[PDB]
Structure formats: structure tokens, C-alpha cells
Design an enzyme around this catalytic site. Structure first.
Site, PDB file in Angstrom:
ATOM      1  N   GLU A 128     -27.202  79.169 -57.412  1.00 40.97           N
ATOM      2  CA  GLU A 128     -27.338  77.723 -57.205  1.00 40.97           C
ATOM      3  C   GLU A 128     -27.856  77.307 -55.815  1.00 40.97           C
ATOM      4  O   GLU A 128     -28.725  76.451 -55.745  1.00 40.97           O
ATOM      5  CB  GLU A 128     -26.017  77.012 -57.493  1.00 40.97           C
ATOM      6  CG  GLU A 128     -25.563  77.039 -58.955  1.00 40.97           C
ATOM      7  CD  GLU A 128     -26.395  76.175 -59.869  1.00 40.97           C
ATOM      8  OE1 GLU A 128     -27.315  75.484 -59.386  1.00 40.97           O
ATOM      9  OE2 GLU A 128     -26.116  76.173 -61.080  1.00 40.97           O
TER      10      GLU A 128
ATOM     11  N   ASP B 196     -31.794  69.477 -56.025  1.00 37.44           N
ATOM     12  CA  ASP B 196     -32.238  68.902 -57.326  1.00 37.44           C
ATOM     13  C   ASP B 196     -32.657  67.390 -57.587  1.00 37.44           C
ATOM     14  O   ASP B 196     -32.165  66.814 -58.562  1.00 37.44           O
ATOM     15  CB  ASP B 196     -31.256  69.334 -58.433  1.00 37.44           C
ATOM     16  CG  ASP B 196     -31.828  69.118 -59.821  1.00 37.44           C
ATOM     17  OD1 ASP B 196     -33.043  69.375 -60.005  1.00 37.44           O
ATOM     18  OD2 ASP B 196     -31.089  68.649 -60.715  1.00 37.44           O
TER      19      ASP B 196
END
Length: 185
Positions: A69, A86
Site C-alpha cells: 500500500e 490515491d
């Protein structure tokens, strides 16, 4: 919740492996990416172990998600505010998606790790329900895929990663976890 050493994995896709400037792909590439992140992972050892204890989740699986991540914070430390990806939808080491839960704690905190790991346990529960005859290890891999893509887009075991980022999310995280399990950090 399933033995991580027994989950089948093809590792990282070519796309994911190229982004790391690697000449090879698959499980070897996942091992290399996990290894690259292992030194940064040490900073979070107490949090990872505590959270793994509370949730009954292998710390190697937590470390693998942290590596996938945010590369153990390396790609998120310098946002404003820090800890975002993101872009500004995923928060923290494990990238809790703000659209589905309120992201709690500092980006590099135990409370953040605790939330993100509870969220994964939610998905184990949902995948166990959805595919009760899958094996315990198959269920764990489906849960990891669903952490990335939602349980609504985990449709079969063979195509578990077909609707994930990189088309390899659970395969890559699984192979990274197998690396941390064998090697430690």
C-alpha cells in the site's frame, strides 16, 4: 484465519514489477519489494505485533499490506497533510479508503494499523460467508483481494485478482507476506 505459507501465489504482475525497475516478475519480484521495505518496517514492529495479537492475524500479512500500500510510508510521508495516497482517498501505512470508513489515528500510528487490520478481518468474515467451501487459505487470499477491490468484485478463486489494482493485489501481498514470514523484519 488460514496459514499464509499455504496460500498459492503467482506474485507481482509485470506492470507492478516494472514500476519497481525490476527485470523479472512474479513471486521473486514480490520478495524483492518486501525486502526493500523491510528496514522501514522495523519502525512499526511494536504496532504490527500488538495489532496482530488483538486481531489474530499474522504480522507478516500486516507487514505485506503496509509494503504493498505505501512501501512502509516511503511513497506517502511527504503529502500535505502527510500519509495520503490515491490521491487523497487512501490514508495511512495500509491506505484505509476514506470513502468507506473515517480514517482514524495519525498516518503512521497503531490506531491506524488497528483500523486497517480490523477492516481486513471484516473482509475475511464476508469472504468466509460468500465462499464457505473455499479452503481457509483460499478465503484469506480472497479477503486480501477484497481489501483492495471490495467483496463485490471477488467472484471466483482463479480470477481473485482480476478486478484488483495491477491485477495482482492478493498474489503480490501474499508473496510479500511469505517473504516477511520466512525472513522476519
Amino acid at each position: 484465519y488460514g496459514d499464509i505459507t499455504q496460500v498459492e501465489t503467482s506474485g507481482a504482475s509485470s506492470k507492478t514489477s516494472r514500476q519497481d525497475k525490476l527485470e523479472y516478475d512474479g513471486v521473486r519480484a514480490s520478495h524483492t519489494m518486501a525486502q526493500t521495505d523491510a528496514g522501514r518496517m522495523e519502525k512499526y514492529k511494536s504496532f504490527i505485533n500488538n495489532v496482530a495479537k488483538k486481531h489474530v492475524v499474522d504480522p507478516a500479512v500486516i507487514a505485506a499490506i503496509i509494503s504493498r500500500e505505501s512501501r512502509a510510508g516511503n511513497v506517502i510521508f511527504n503529502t500535505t497533510p502527510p500519509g495520503w495516497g490515491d490521491n487523497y482517498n487512501g490514508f495511512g501505512l495500509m491506505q484505509v479508503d476514506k470513502r468507506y470508513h473515517e480514517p482514524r489515528g495519525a498516518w503512521n500510528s497503531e490506531e491506524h494499523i488497528d483500523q486497517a487490520t480490523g477492516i481486513l478481518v471484516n473482509f475475511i468474515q464476508l469472504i468466509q460467508k460468500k465462499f464457505p467451501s473455499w479452503s481457509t487459505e483460499q478465503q484469506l487470499k480472497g479477503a486480501i483481494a477484497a481489501y483492495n477491490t471490495g467483496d463485490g468484485r471477488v467472484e471466483s478463486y482463479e480470477s481473485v485478482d482480476s478486478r484488483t489494482t495491477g491485477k495482482d493485489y492478493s498474489n503480490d501481498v501474499v508473496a510479500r507476506a511469505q517473504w516477511y514470514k520466512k525472513n522476519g523484519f
